Structure formats: structure tokens, C-alpha cells
Amino acid sequence: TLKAGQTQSFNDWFPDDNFASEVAAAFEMQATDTISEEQLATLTSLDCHNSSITDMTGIEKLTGLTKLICTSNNITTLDLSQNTNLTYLACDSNKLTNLDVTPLTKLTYLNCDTNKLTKLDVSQNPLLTYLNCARNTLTEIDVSHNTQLTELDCHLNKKITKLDVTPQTQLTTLDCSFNKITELDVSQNKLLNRLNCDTNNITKLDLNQNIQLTFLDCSSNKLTEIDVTPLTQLTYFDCSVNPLTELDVSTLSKLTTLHCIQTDLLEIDLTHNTQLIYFQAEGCRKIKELDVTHNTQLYLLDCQAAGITELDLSQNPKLVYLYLNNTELTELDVSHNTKLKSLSCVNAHIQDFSSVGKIPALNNNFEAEGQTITMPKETLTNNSLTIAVSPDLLDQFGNPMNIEPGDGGVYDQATNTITWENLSTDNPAVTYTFTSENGAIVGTVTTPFE
Ligand SMILES: [Cl-]
């Protein structure tokens, strides 16, 4: 017997006006048109995203539904106990404090991202392939019964301390970022391709079995060491904000992006990463040498704070963005880097900036303030001292710079010397600032005495 049931307006079926109105449009009808229980049951798919819906009461009557999208609404509860034919559920960006999916035994896609869930029970969903409980307030997530899971996103729950994916042998994408995870065993996830476990408390990460990762981000963790040598397919690798002291990327022939910001590395060998486009290594304070000569397609180089006294940029024609601020450089040469839109080398120990004027786009977009130069000491003669202003002090266009002595001292332009009167061994040095006429370059030259 196929019973018709009651026949009434969508507005009478669905108390929420905005919901009734969306269910109506699903049948290409108005909210005030009448429809039967048997008619309502024929709808296999519903999309009411971004509709100002607070209440989904009446959903129990749409029993033919295999797909429900209610994203970007104000829904505080969703009783889906009668919608047992659902295979796809997107209820993300709502105000759900709880969500029961235990009756939905045919469910293969579940997205409840950005809600207020404290528990989530997916143990009755054995066909699950996409679970996304991102941006909830969960403390754990048992996926032990969900063996067909290909993608898991439990990022930004904040309180997750344990994650077990040892049974998820089909996992290709994992995002467990911004939690308190301390151990991640990914050795059974042989098909893994994308891994993001950043912003956790992971101390060890064994990736030896995951030899077909293409994307890896283990940044902001507590990794003392890591072995990426087996991961020959990697194109993007990010291990920033870890206390790693040694990193071996020689096997990563396909690497395009390497981020190792704020790591403790003593050295780094980029010579085999011929395809490298982005190397971002700001705060790699222990590095004292950088050979980017084999990285011929480098588009952006950032090694701020690095202890490099020089940097051979001859082989990097494609460079558009270079960041050398806070380095130990005493020499700069960007003449072969004609694509540069932005150069920055604040707080270095540079004198001659003449190579930068070779690139006219840099005439304006150029910062080189806070230079700190240190000269060999002289002896006094009477209570006085004359010195030659360093000839290497040359600006962007190879012109002299303006000399402002740490004044008791008179700069003589003719002779390009400074003479201070009344100097004391109590205060054992003399200084002068230099500034370029465009104001892009500023520094000091300390000269000790006696
Ligand atoms: Cl009505």
C-alpha cells in the first residue's frame, strides 16, 4: 500500500518559513502550495545553504533524501533519525551542540565543520570516506570502526590529544592541525598523499612507510629530528617552528616549496632540488652558508636572520622577491637578478649598495636601514683623531652618502675625512652615521682607538 497521507502547505509541513520556502523550491513550488507525505518522500536531494534557517523540524518527512546540504544556517539541532537513506550530509557552519548520525548507516560523506560539538559518534558509519569535524570543541575522535576512510579533517578542535588512524589503510588525506596531539602513527597509511599535522605537540614522526606523500606540513611541533629521504614524490615540504638541527632534502628532486622557518639547522643542502621555486627560511639563525646556485628557478628567497657573510645570486634569474634582513652579510650583489620587484636587507653589515641600482624597479621598493659596520682601530695623536671615511660606502647608484658624525667631529668633504677634537681613552671609539639621499640606506661606522 502506497498511502498518500496528509496533504498540506509547505508552510504547514515545515514551521520555519525559510526552510519551508527552500523545501518548496526543491519541488519548484511556492511555500503556500500543498503537497502530500507520499509526494514529500520522492525528493532524493535538498540544498538550503545560506538561508537564515534556525529550525529543521519537518525534515523527518523527506525520507527519500540521499543528500542534505544545510551549510551556513543557524541550526541548533538536526533530528535525522527518519532520513536513513542519506549517503551525503553537509551541516557545516551551523550552531549544532550535538549531532546523532548513528541511524545513518549508508553515510559516506559527513561535513559538520564549524559547529559546537563536544562528542561525535561515527562508529555506525562503516561506509564513511570523508569525515570533516573541523572547528568543533572535541577532545577525542574514534574512527576505529570507519575502515574505508580516505580523508579525515579534525583540525582546529584544539583539545584532541590522541589520534589513532592505524586501521584507516585507505587514507590519502589527513588534516589534524591545531590540536594537542603528541603521537602520530601513520605507518599503516601507505596510500597517504597529503599530511597536515601542524600545530600539535608531536616529538617523533616516522614517515618511512608513507613513500608517496606529495604534500607534508609538520610545522609548529616539537620534532628534534626527521627523515624525509624516502619521500621522493614531495613537492611541498614545511617543517617550520620545530627544533630540528639537521635536514636532508637531497632525495626531493620534485620539490617546489621548502619552508623551514624558525628551525635550528646548522647547514642546508639545496643543490639537488633543481625544481625549487620557494625557499622560506626566516629565523634560521645557526645557518652560516647558503648555496642557491643549483636552484635556477627560485622565484622567492627568504633567509632572514641567517649568518651568511655573502650570497652568490648569479644563478637565480627568475627571483622576484628576496629577503636578506637581519643577516650577517658584509656584501650584496643582485646585478644578475633583473626580475626583482622587492629587495630588503635591513640590519646587515653592508657598505656598497651599487649593484641595486642595476635593477630600476628597486629604485623605490628598497630597504637597507640599520647597517652596522666595524673598522680596524687607530691610535690617537694629541687629544685628537683624523680618519678617512670608508671608500666602500656607496649608495644604490654608486654615489657618496651623507656623513653625520657622532658629533664632536667635523666631516671634511674635500678630503672625505672626519676629525674629532678632544677624544678620551675613557670613551674608546668614534662613530658616524651614513644616509643615502633617497633614504633607503642608513647605517653606522664604529672606529675604535688607542
Ligand atoms: Cl500557508
Side-chain angles (χ1 to χ4, degrees), residues 175-338:
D175 183 351
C176 63
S177 47
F178 303 91
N179 289 300
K180 315 295 193 54
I181 300 171
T182 55
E183 274 175 338
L184 200 63
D185 190 359
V186 291
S187 59
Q188 310 305 295
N189 310 102
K190 288 160 150 42
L191 304 177
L192 205 54
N193 177 268
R194 185 183 296 273
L195 180 63
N196 184 341
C197 65
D198 79 50
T199 310
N200 278 279
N201 303 313
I202 307 182
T203 55
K204 194 159 81 178
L205 189 70
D206 170 34
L207 299 172
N208 287 359
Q209 309 305 310
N210 311 102
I211 70 172
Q212 57 185 0
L213 283 164
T214 59
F215 186 99
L216 177 50
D217 185 359
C218 53
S219 63
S220 291
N221 269 288
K222 301 154 175 178
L223 297 181
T224 66
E225 65 189 62
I226 193 166
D227 180 16
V228 290
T229 68
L231 313 171
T232 70
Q233 304 305 285
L234 281 175
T235 67
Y236 180 110
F237 180 31
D238 191 344
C239 62
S240 298
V241 195
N242 292 295
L244 296 166
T245 69
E246 184 213 307
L247 192 64
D248 181 0
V249 298
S250 58
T251 70
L252 309 186
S253 69
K254 298 178 185 170
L255 195 64
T256 75
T257 314
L258 183 44
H259 308 146
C260 62
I261 294 156
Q262 293 177 228
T263 50
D264 297 327
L265 309 177
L266 311 174
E267 57 168 49
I268 180 88
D269 189 16
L270 304 186
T271 61
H272 312 86
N273 314 99
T274 69
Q275 298 178 229
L276 189 59
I277 301 174
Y278 294 86
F279 172 61
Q280 274 147 298
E282 161 183 36
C284 289
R285 231 159 285 267
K286 287 58 164 185
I287 296 179
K288 59 178 201 155
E289 215 168 32
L290 186 57
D291 172 10
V292 296
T293 68
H294 290 66
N295 306 111
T296 69
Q297 297 196 10
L298 258 184
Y299 183 87
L300 175 165
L301 194 177
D302 180 343
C303 62
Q304 293 173 44
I308 55 165
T309 65
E310 63 183 352
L311 182 60
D312 178 10
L313 303 165
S314 58
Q315 309 310 315
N316 311 118
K318 211 155 182 190
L319 265 178
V320 186
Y321 294 99
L322 177 46
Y323 303 92
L324 303 180
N325 285 9
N326 300 340
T327 60
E328 281 266 48
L329 295 179
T330 69
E331 168 259 310
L332 181 74
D333 182 8
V334 298
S335 42
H336 306 100
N337 305 115
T338 82

Side-chain angles (χ1 to χ4, degrees), residues 16-230:
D16 187 302
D17 284 359
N18 287 335
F19 183 39
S21 197
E22 292 293 313
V23 176
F27 297 89
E28 277 164 301
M29 292 172 78
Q30 291 164 115
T32 61
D33 294 339
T34 74
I35 195 169
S36 68
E37 299 180 57
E38 188 266 317
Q39 283 169 335
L40 284 177
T42 72
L43 196 70
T44 55
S45 180
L46 182 67
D47 196 340
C48 59
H49 71 282
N50 192 41
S51 296
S52 306
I53 289 158
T54 54
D55 208 326
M56 296 282 298
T57 184
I59 190 64
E60 64 279 9
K61 295 291 177 162
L62 297 178
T63 68
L65 276 175
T66 68
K67 183 163 187 168
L68 179 74
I69 292 176
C70 57
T71 299
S72 298
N73 276 295
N74 290 313
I75 296 159
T76 48
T77 206
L78 193 61
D79 171 36
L80 304 175
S81 63
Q82 310 302 311
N83 304 94
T84 53
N85 293 313
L86 278 172
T87 67
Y88 183 106
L89 176 49
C91 64
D92 54 308
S93 288
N94 272 293
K95 295 181 175 191
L96 291 158
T97 60
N98 52 290
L99 170 73
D100 190 12
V101 301
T102 68
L104 303 178
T105 62
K106 309 177 197 183
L107 191 63
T108 66
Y109 186 100
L110 173 49
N111 187 353
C112 60
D113 183 328
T114 310
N115 273 293
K116 309 188 169 198
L117 299 170
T118 54
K119 314 292 284 178
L120 180 62
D121 183 14
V122 299
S123 62
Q124 313 307 321
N125 305 108
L127 307 189
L128 254 196
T129 63
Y130 178 89
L131 176 63
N132 180 354
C133 54
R135 284 174 288 177
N136 281 285
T137 53
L138 298 177
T139 59
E140 59 180 63
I141 190 58
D142 182 6
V143 303
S144 67
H145 301 269
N146 304 101
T147 63
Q148 311 304 104
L149 212 39
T150 54
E151 176 159 12
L152 173 52
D153 187 347
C154 63
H155 92 264
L156 268 170
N157 280 281
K158 302 181 180 172
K159 310 303 183 310
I160 298 179
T161 70
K162 330 302 169 204
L163 188 50
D164 181 18
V165 304
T166 60
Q168 283 59 53
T169 64
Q170 300 291 106
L171 202 59
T172 75
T173 291
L174 180 57
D175 183 351
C176 63
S177 47
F178 303 91
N179 289 300
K180 315 295 193 54
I181 300 171
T182 55
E183 274 175 338
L184 200 63
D185 190 359
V186 291
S187 59
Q188 310 305 295
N189 310 102
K190 288 160 150 42
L191 304 177
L192 205 54
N193 177 268
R194 185 183 296 273
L195 180 63
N196 184 341
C197 65
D198 79 50
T199 310
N200 278 279
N201 303 313
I202 307 182
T203 55
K204 194 159 81 178
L205 189 70
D206 170 34
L207 299 172
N208 287 359
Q209 309 305 310
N210 311 102
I211 70 172
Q212 57 185 0
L213 283 164
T214 59
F215 186 99
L216 177 50
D217 185 359
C218 53
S219 63
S220 291
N221 269 288
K222 301 154 175 178
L223 297 181
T224 66
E225 65 189 62
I226 193 166
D227 180 16
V228 290
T229 68

Side-chain angles (χ1 to χ4, degrees), residues 395-397 400-402 404 434-443:
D395 80 351
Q396 197 157 2
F397 326 90
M401 286 178 274
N402 298 119
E404 299 73 50
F434 58 89
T435 319
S436 66
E437 275 291 319
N438 58 23
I441 299 170
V442 197

Side-chain angles (χ1 to χ4, degrees), residues 8-12 31-34:
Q8 49 187 4
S9 71
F10 291 92
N11 276 321
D12 283 343
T32 61
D33 294 339
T34 74

